[PDB]
């Protein structure tokens, strides 16, 4: 999609969704150079504040410059995000007893993983046969 | 570590009934934080292929943990 | 991360005779005896405003309120961004939302979430420089 | 991506006599005993 966004009301148009911008530089042979600007946006209906569209305009946005080989599936980027959180609330004498400690406390656990890889694959074609 | 009290000034001091008059509020708090870094230099495509194969197997095993069997690509 | 509170208080409401009433109001932990004798009038019409793990031993005027709570929260975050780059090439990973913020209303877009910007400088050998 | 919450709490409302009532209000997981004794009055008119 293409959405508006306020810059004041003096709103402006702005693109949201999967996107890719490559710029190569090609040797006569192996080992091409790439200038990648890849991104994945989104748009969020759930967590809305007292304000406008909470546009996830980057959810991944890797703007890198790599140098690859013409048949090699390589890895450009990644994110491994792990989380574990836990709150309690108890009567300070009675929650401790490990026989009735469930009957007084109040627990809240939260585990969270986000694994993310961004791979790239270049193929060099110079004759129309391979194309 | 922080701790506030509020008591009747004669009766909270007695270490037999001092709990029965005062009002305490304790607060302990820790935040540990490290930021580490790891560089790996690759200059031939062999080591880049090795890194790619290790990360690709390490994401395949996350695929290996409905949620049916995920797929390889043209490696 | 982690934290632990521990709030505990004994309150005495001996209203043995006379105008007044020998109540030991401690406005430290949530409720109090003053709002408890107003909570008598709450128990009349509204029955409002509790707070904390309360225990009320009273002969309905001769009172003793014990209020206690023990919060205990822990947390454990981990993150591993990782990217490939050449030297002298500003790479970037940005994961997570893009929000507005007021600069007046003349709002502006701004990125929120895990992020990394590396710039190397590479010797022919060991001991790379990173920014 | 993935996440898992786990929220669980026991609340005790022993109002055995006296002005007060020995209720163990834990305002952690949703409802509470204070809003439960107000939910008695909700069960009277609104039930909310």
Numbering used by the authors:
A (entry chain G): 433 to 440, 454 to 576
B (entry chain H): 529 to 593, 604 to 613
C (entry chain H): 337 to 440, 454 to 480
D (entry chain G): 337 to 384
The article reads:
In Gram-negative bacteria, the type 2 secretion system (T2SS) is composed of a pseudopilus assembly platform in the inner membrane and a secretin complex in the outer membrane. Pseudomonas aeruginosa has at least two T2SSs, with the ancestral nanomachine having a secretin complex composed of XcpQ. The T2SS containing XcpQ is responsible for the secretion of at least 19 substrates, most of them hydrolases ranging from proteases to hemolytic lipases that are critical for pathogenesis. In the T2SS secretins, each subunit consists of four N domains followed by the highly conserved secretin domain (Pfam PF00263), followed by an S domain.
